[PDB]
Design a protein around this nucleic acid. Structure first.
Ligand SMILES: [Mg+2]
Ligand SMILES: [Mg+2]
Ligand SMILES: [Mg+2]
Ligand SMILES: [Mg+2]
Ligand SMILES: [Mg+2]
Ligand SMILES: [Mg+2]
Ligand SMILES: [Mg+2]
Ligand SMILES: [Mg+2]
Ligand SMILES: [Mg+2]
Ligand SMILES: [Mg+2]
Ligand SMILES: [Mg+2]
Ligand SMILES: [Mg+2]
Ligand SMILES: [Mg+2]
Ligand SMILES: [Mg+2]
Ligand SMILES: [Mg+2]
Ligand SMILES: [Mg+2]
Ligand SMILES: [Mg+2]
Ligand SMILES: [Mg+2]
Ligand SMILES: [Mg+2]
Ligand SMILES: [Mg+2]
Ligand SMILES: [Mg+2]
Ligand SMILES: [Mg+2]
Ligand SMILES: [Mg+2]
Ligand SMILES: [Mg+2]
Ligand SMILES: [Mg+2]
Ligand SMILES: [Mg+2]
Ligand SMILES: [Mg+2]
Ligand SMILES: [Mg+2]
Ligand SMILES: [Mg+2]
Ligand SMILES: [Mg+2]
Ligand SMILES: [Mg+2]
Ligand SMILES: [Mg+2]
Ligand SMILES: [Mg+2]
Ligand SMILES: [Mg+2]
Ligand SMILES: [Mg+2]
Ligand SMILES: [Mg+2]
Ligand SMILES: [Mg+2]
Ligand SMILES: [Mg+2]
Ligand SMILES: [Mg+2]
Ligand SMILES: [Mg+2]
Ligand SMILES: [Mg+2]
Ligand SMILES: [Mg+2]
Ligand SMILES: [Mg+2]
Ligand SMILES: [Mg+2]
Ligand SMILES: [Mg+2]
Ligand SMILES: [Mg+2]
Ligand SMILES: [Mg+2]
Ligand SMILES: [Mg+2]
Ligand SMILES: [Mg+2]
Ligand SMILES: [Mg+2]
Ligand SMILES: [Mg+2]
Ligand SMILES: [Mg+2]
Ligand SMILES: [Mg+2]
Ligand SMILES: [Mg+2]
Ligand SMILES: [Mg+2]
Ligand SMILES: [Mg+2]
Ligand SMILES: [Mg+2]
Ligand SMILES: [Mg+2]
Ligand SMILES: [Mg+2]
Ligand SMILES: [Mg+2]
Ligand SMILES: [Mg+2]
Ligand SMILES: [Mg+2]
Ligand SMILES: [Mg+2]
Ligand SMILES: [Mg+2]
Ligand SMILES: [Mg+2]
Ligand SMILES: [Zn+2]
Lengths: 50, 52, 135, 86, 134, 122, 59
RNA sequence: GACUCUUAGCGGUGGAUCACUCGGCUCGUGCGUCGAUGAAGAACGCAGCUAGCUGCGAGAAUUAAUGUGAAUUGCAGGUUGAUCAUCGACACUUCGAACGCACUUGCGGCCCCGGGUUCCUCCCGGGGCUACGCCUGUCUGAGCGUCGCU
RNA sequence: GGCCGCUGCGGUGAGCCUUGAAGCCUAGGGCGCGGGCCCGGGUGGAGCCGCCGCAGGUGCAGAUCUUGGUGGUAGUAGCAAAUAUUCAAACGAGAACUUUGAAGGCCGAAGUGGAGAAGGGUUCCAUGUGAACAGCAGUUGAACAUGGGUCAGUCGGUCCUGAGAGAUGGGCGAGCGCCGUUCCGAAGGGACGGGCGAUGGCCUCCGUUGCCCUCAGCCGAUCGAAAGGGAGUCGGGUUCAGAU
RNA sequence: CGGUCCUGACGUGCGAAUCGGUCGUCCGACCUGGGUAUAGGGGCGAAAGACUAAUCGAACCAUCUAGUAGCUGGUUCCCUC
RNA sequence: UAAAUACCGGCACGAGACCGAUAGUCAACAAGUACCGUAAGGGAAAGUUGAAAAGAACUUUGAAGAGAGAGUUCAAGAGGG
RNA sequence: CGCGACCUCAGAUCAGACGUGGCGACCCGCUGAAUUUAAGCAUAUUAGUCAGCGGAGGAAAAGAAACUAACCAGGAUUCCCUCAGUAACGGCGAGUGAACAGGGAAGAGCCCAGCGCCGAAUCCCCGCCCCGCGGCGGGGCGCGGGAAAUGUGGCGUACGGAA
């Protein structure tokens, strides 16, 4: 909704910040096993709770 | 499996000493020692005793 | 006395446990008094208590409490034992005289079900299968 | 209208996030937390849920003060002194 | 046989410690033996490798008698790079081939005050050990 | 050049503050350059400037607190910051003198019947 | 400008006056969906925003 | 000749077996330490390029000091001590027993400073206080409670 | 009774092994009544076995057994609720579906229109791509990747109380705590004004003041509505996405 | 707002109760949003054992619990007597 | 009012006729994680290139995925699950 | 009427302290079932057990006989072996169930109130001076302030004690 609280807006801001693909320069580290970000979140599919 | 399985055993002192005596008696026979596999062919005397 | 706090006297179970009226409390009223006195006075320490009066519906007791951080107590070598942390809330753990009275502890053939630290300690010592390595 | 049709009328929530434990279990009309009982002074914890007991205990968080406490105990809680200057 | 009751023979524990050692322990692990002449003239058998020492390769495909200068000590991968031990990539770029310091023999040390202090400490320890033994 | 901490102990609070302000101005300029798009050199110097800020501030704080400890050293009542922060139990325990003082009766008992040193022939 | 979430318009105006030696007419503020708080700072009519941007370093 | 069946070779799908193991499980040993000087737990932020994990707290992948002594590394960047380890000095955002009142982050009170005033009041910013119970002492009180003097 | 089979331990085989161990496949040669075993060929790349004893989480075809994978069905059932598409051009490697123009239609103002509340949380805007997704296809997208975007004294929250929830006093309770909302409370920290004592401002007159004199009921702290109560903004322009 | 009949459509559906035509009421014992109160042997019920988050002739979650079963199913190599 | 006594939590340790990735803790890996439920709570799957990336320059058909050659390697019959 | 004591009771953002909450493997105090067994079931059993509540420590609790015994007597507490599946309990069914003595590990005892006698001989706090100072203590000085006779300190406690 357009009517938000400061706390809920801040929480949504953090989740939006962390919804991001990985940078490719980490893929070239020595002991790196990560291939993609497996904690992605599409708005339509996963509804984030709340 | 449980930790209170009977792990240890109990043997009488008399037959423990019996077994020690039997082992010592067997350890003085070249046939038995060579059967156990030791290379004692050049050993002068089997109950090999050296000074103190 | 103490009645069983059960909704509308409905103890769902066997008939042996159906009573709610004529029940009694294990601890004494003096011990209950000391307990709530110490509970309100959290920073103080309870020593003992005595009886000062009673009517049909009430009993009255006076509880003797000690402030453990007063220097007049801290510097006295014969009463600084109360300042040790092991004596914190004696009346809660039943260490005062009234609490000890309801624990059934003492020397002799009458108190056989308490030999050891306490009743629970005796029960635990008796109900344990000692399994030696060689049995 | 027992199922699919009635699922469409659900549009206002009964729980929000609570200040103490941060879980969506703060009942709004009750004003009480379903997980920790926030208004109560004491933490809500029960012995019939070992999984719930271990999900959020001393071993699960940051240990901000208590790990430093362990490190200082290893040397005996020294204060006021500094290592011998070069 | 090991008699100290406070160190492990546990294979897993030794592997974990070796592969998780911090950098100042990696330095101690990355030790190479000095040449015969240096060993005779310093009474020290080994020295942790440094960035600018002349060395030789003793084992592998690159073994030989040439004297190579260390380029960098790559402590993360437990390898060191020498100035002419390198292969050819596909495009035409020359990259270095890592070699473990235990397969490398030091030829001329890079001396400074702290290195000299280490050498004299090790020499004194061996002298006192030999005096005790004999 | 390279701002260190040894050459800052002997200084004075006012030039410490002015150096801190200059460093903060430099950091602000570096952040503007970062957001507008600048050189990797400046981008790398950002962290150096931040650490210089940190060490200037810690030198200031350490000098202030040691001076304040000297001020309150002789007094009986001092701030909770300047009191020793051991564990709570060790703050509540009986102090060394009063857990060692003893009653006259049992000290007389000790002085009248000291525990002797003796041996018994086999 | 982008400022922190704990700043109000009075503090923003005073900080701009202190840092850049300019006069400030009015301040609009909003909190972006990212979490940072943007600020729109209008200047007095006798200052020139182009010149202020030139001196600050943005262009 | 098509189609179907069996067999073998080869090639697919699939991840069985074998060998590995910075993981567990069990036993034993020493120590046996939280919090109003603000704990456990939660939230939010911090890297030149950084999502998660990890570390940290507006001094924010750490400062100071001690020891070691030439690196970090995926890419850039510029020995009078880089990096690691130790850790005794400093510092430590908002909630949380959580403490001005409420829990929107809303509304206050008292005192002292710098802007305003040139204290005359406003207004702005900053700092220090402002919870419950309780012990000792202090001050101010109350009572047709027991008295004494007038 | 097993010189049948599996895993580990104590002894033994001067046992085997990168000139190739385990495992796997085999229209190869055999042995044993059988459990099974030994050789040959290929693959594979680091460990394995015989005999004497010891120990056991020790042998599968079934349990509408558990987990994982794969078949026939089968290129089958199906992609059929709400009237409908057509011509030409452009981009493009590629057009039934994208876009533009033209034609024919539908919703028909209780709309397939223009705007909000709850709820969602970046889906909104531009560019780029066409691996995956949009049950055909896509040059398209609410997909993917880069970047942007939400501006208030006068819109609302903020304030009030409503039905109701809830502390202190009090009562009850082994206890965490509960009842209770004016009921068993010494429940006011305010002030018209006068005096007393100190202070600053040209100590004028006033202000900030501590005390005395005097005056004084709250229906009970506190919470409770973005649709109730509640002073105060309208017109024109402006973006790609914001406008009282 | 509701849900008679076709016992129509569908019945591995559009849908774990929907669709069409036909139907009942439509100024009141009327329809409805938000707030609020009542909690499990309890609530609430113009009363059908109805409803109480697809669950109701006693909800849901964890534990006691690996509850008991004179009852169904299964129970792993060979040869010899 | 010490000692002899108890200890599946915590800080360090040492060992094992134990399991060896459908096993052993649910968790050998970004595991109380992803995800599900309004909530109390429920809760996974997932190890292995090579000694060393030397991770396939370059030529060519195709829009491209994708191929045919060339090359590294002892081995691509190890080509980024 | 006023003033001054004492007694009971109030308000302080008065000076200085203390409690709250967490973990909970072990410990202390309350509360306390039903599956199950009895081939049914109600006493009994499960079981003073799980669940629930409160309170600590590095250990806790207990502890120096209002004891055991009936002997030629032993001698605080706690733990191990045995006593012993015994005496006893039990629809005397199912089932349950100690202690004394003996051998060991450890080994340590003490203090008040009261009766009495000592010019309250007792304690806390504020101020100065000197030293010490990261456990706030020692000493000197105050015609300094309180607590206490409605009883502080010394001797003294059943093994007797005092003069
Ligand atoms: Mg949806
Ligand atoms: Mg009963
Ligand atoms: Mg009871
Ligand atoms: Mg005691
Ligand atoms: Mg009695
Ligand atoms: Mg509701
Ligand atoms: Mg609790
Ligand atoms: Mg040694
Ligand atoms: Mg005495
Ligand atoms: Mg075949
Ligand atoms: Mg697999
Ligand atoms: Mg594989
Ligand atoms: Mg970041
Ligand atoms: Mg440093
Ligand atoms: Mg250094
Ligand atoms: Mg509100
Ligand atoms: Mg290998
Ligand atoms: Mg086994
Ligand atoms: Mg099978
Ligand atoms: Mg068909
Ligand atoms: Mg259709
Ligand atoms: Mg029509
Ligand atoms: Mg619209
Ligand atoms: Mg619309
Ligand atoms: Mg769009
Ligand atoms: Mg498609
Ligand atoms: Mg305007
Ligand atoms: Mg309000
Ligand atoms: Mg209440
Ligand atoms: Mg309103
Ligand atoms: Mg309104
Ligand atoms: Mg019907
Ligand atoms: Mg039908
Ligand atoms: Mg059909
Ligand atoms: Mg009721
Ligand atoms: Mg009705
Ligand atoms: Mg009926
Ligand atoms: Mg029920
Ligand atoms: Mg079952
Ligand atoms: Mg039968
Ligand atoms: Mg050992
Ligand atoms: Mg697997
Ligand atoms: Mg597993
Ligand atoms: Mg496997
Ligand atoms: Mg396996
Ligand atoms: Mg594999
Ligand atoms: Mg390997
Ligand atoms: Mg090969
Ligand atoms: Mg291979
Ligand atoms: Mg105070
Ligand atoms: Mg507590
Ligand atoms: Mg039965
Ligand atoms: Mg039966
Ligand atoms: Mg029955
Ligand atoms: Mg019964
Ligand atoms: Mg019983
Ligand atoms: Mg329990
Ligand atoms: Mg503790
Ligand atoms: Mg004790
Ligand atoms: Mg006695
Ligand atoms: Mg017997
Ligand atoms: Mg019993
Ligand atoms: Mg005995
Ligand atoms: Mg002894
Ligand atoms: Mg006396
Ligand atoms: Zn909560």
């Amino acid at each position: 909704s357009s009517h938000k609280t400061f706390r809920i807006k801040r929480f949504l801001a953090k989740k939006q910040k962390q919804n991001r693909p990985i940078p490719q320069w980490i893929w070239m580290k020595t002991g790196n096993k990560i291939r993609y970000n497996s904690k992605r979140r599409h708005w339509r599919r996963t509804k984030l709770g709340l | 499996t449980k930790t209170w399985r009977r792990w240890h055993r109990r043997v009488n002192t008399t037959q423990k000493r019996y077994a020690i005596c039997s082992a010592l008696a067997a350890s003085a026979l070249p046939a038995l020692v060579m059967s156990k596999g030791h290379r004692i062919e050049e050993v002068p005397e089997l109950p090999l005793v050296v000074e103190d | 006395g103490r009645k069983r706090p059960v909704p509308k006297g409905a103890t769902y179970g066997k008939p042996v446990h159906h009573g709610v009226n004529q029940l009694k409390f294990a601890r004494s009223l003096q011990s209950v008094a000391e307990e709530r006195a110490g509970r309100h006075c959290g920073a103080l320490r309870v020593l003992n208590s005595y009886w000062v009066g009673e009517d049909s519906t009430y009993k009255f007791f006076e509880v003797i409490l000690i402030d453990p951080f007063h220097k007049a107590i801290r510097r006295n070598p014969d009463t600084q034992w109360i300042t040790k942390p092991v004596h914190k809330h004696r009346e809660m753990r039943g260490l005062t005289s009234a609490g000890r009275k309801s624990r059934g502890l003492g020397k002799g053939h009458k108190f056989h079900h308490t030999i050891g630290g306490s009743r629970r300690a005796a029960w635990r010592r008796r109900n344990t299968l000692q399994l030696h390595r060689y049995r | 209208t027992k199922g699919t049709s009635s699922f469409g009328k659900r549009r206002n929530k009964t729980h929000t996030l609570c200040r103490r434990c941060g879980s969506k279990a703060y009942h709004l009309q009750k004003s009480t937390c379903g997980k920790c009982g926030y208004p109560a002074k004491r933490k809500r914890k029960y012995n019939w849920s070992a999984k719930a007991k271990r999900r959020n205990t001393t071993g699960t968080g940051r240990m901000r003060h208590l790990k430093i406490v362990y490190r200082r105990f290893r040397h005996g809680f020294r204060e006021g002194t500094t290592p011998k200057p070069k | 046989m090991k008699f100290n009751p406070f160190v492990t023979s546990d294979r897993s524990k030794n592997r974990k410690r070796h592969f998780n050692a911090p950098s100042h322990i990696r330095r101690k692990i990355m030790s190479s033996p000095l040449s015969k002449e240096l060993r005779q003239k310093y009474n020290v058998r080994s020295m942790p490798i440094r960035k600018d020492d002349e060395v030789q390769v003793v084992r592998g495909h690159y073994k030989g008698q040439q004297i190579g200068k260390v380029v960098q000590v790559y402590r993360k991968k437990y390898v060191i790079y020498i100035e002419r031990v390198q292969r050819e990539k596909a495009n035409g770029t020359t990259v270095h081939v890592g070699i473990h310091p235990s397969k490398v023999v030091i030829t001329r040390l890079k001396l400074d005050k702290d290195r000299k202090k280490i050498l004299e400490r090790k020499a004194k320890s061996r002298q006192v050990g030999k005096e005790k033994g004999k | 050049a390279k701002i260190k901490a040894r050459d800052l102990r002997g200084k004075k609070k006012e030039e410490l503050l002015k150096q801190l302000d200059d460093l903060k101005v430099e950091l602000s300029q570096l952040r503007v350059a970062k957001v507008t798009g600048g050189a990797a050199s400046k981008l790398s110097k950002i962290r150096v400037v931040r650490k210089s800020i940190a060490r200037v501030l810690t030198v200031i704080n350490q000098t202030q607190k040691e001076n304040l400890r000297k001020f309150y050293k002789g007094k009986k009542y001092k701030p909770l910051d300047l009191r020793p922060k051991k564990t709570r139990a060790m703050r509540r325990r009986l102090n060394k003198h009063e857990e060692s003082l003893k009653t006259k009766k049992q000290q007389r008992k000790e002085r009248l019947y000291p525990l002797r040193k003796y041996a018994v022939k086999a | 400008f982008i400022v922190d979430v704990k700043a109000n318009k009075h503090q923003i105006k005073q900080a701009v006056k202190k840092l850049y030696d300019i006069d400030v007419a009015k301040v609009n503020t909003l909190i972006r969906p990212d979490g940072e708080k943007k600020a729109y700072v209008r200047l007095a009519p006798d200052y020139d925003a182009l010149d202020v941007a030139n001196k600050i370093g943005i262009i």
